[PDB]
């Protein structure tokens, strides 16, 4: 079969790198949802499908998701939780199971959100990974490790390529991670002591 990967939020610098990677797969076709989607960086690959989408419409988010394998989800701003609420419903609806979802901010309140994101996903009964990348560099390399769900992160920082890399291996081989939700840091960029606040 074809793999049918849905990339929700597909003008996102992590999406960019992700398409890349998945531009010569010519097994895979890749949609690309996204709001303004005259903003995805060119030129188009050949197995690519741009569809103009709101998460939040949810009529058309369910045109997007019919036939879909795989779900790559990088999903900003407000109202994440409802956000994330509307992915799954859409994902059942359509009888989609494997979910990709990155949390980065781009503790405190705003974090409840995407704490109600996490925990709906958890809930779901769906096939996912959520990952949760350290602070964000546009550095050009691919260095990481993975950290567990009760785990510290052990480090600061994480190369976008590096959290690509990743979501592509996971497309690539949809059976790793599932059920897990886990830290992406570089190596050896653990943060000074002692700690302040
Ligand atoms: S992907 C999807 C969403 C909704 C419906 N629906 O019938 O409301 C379908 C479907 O046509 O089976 C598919």
Redesign the pocket.
């Known amino acids: 079969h074809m793999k049918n990967v849905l990339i929700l939020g597909a003008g996102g610098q992590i999406a960019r790198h992700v398409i890349n990677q998945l531009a010569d797969k010519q097994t895979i076709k890749q949609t690309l949802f996204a709001r303004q989607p005259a903003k995805i960086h060119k030129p188009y690959p050949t197995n690519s499908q741009i569809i103009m989408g709101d998460v939040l419409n949810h009529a058309a988010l369910?045109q997007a998701?019919?036939?879909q394998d795989i779900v790559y989800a990088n999903l900003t701003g407000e109202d994440l939780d409802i956000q994330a609420n509307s992915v799954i419903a859409?994902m059942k609806?359509?009888?989609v199971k494997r979910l990709i979802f990155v949390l980065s901010l781009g503790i405190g309140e705003p974090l409840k959100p995407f704490r109600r994101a996490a925990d709906a996903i958890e809930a779901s009964g769906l096939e996912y990974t959520i990952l949760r990348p350290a602070w964000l560099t546009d550095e050009d390399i691919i260095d990481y490790e993975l950290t567990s769900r009760n785990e510290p992160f052990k480090g600061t920082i994480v190369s976008r390529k590096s959290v690509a890399a990743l979501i592509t291996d996971i497309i690539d081989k949809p059976e790793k991670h599932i059920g897990e939700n886990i830290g992406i840091n570089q190596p050896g960029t653990d943060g000074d002591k002692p700690f302040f606040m």
């Open positions: 369910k998701m019919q036939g859409a609806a359509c009888d």
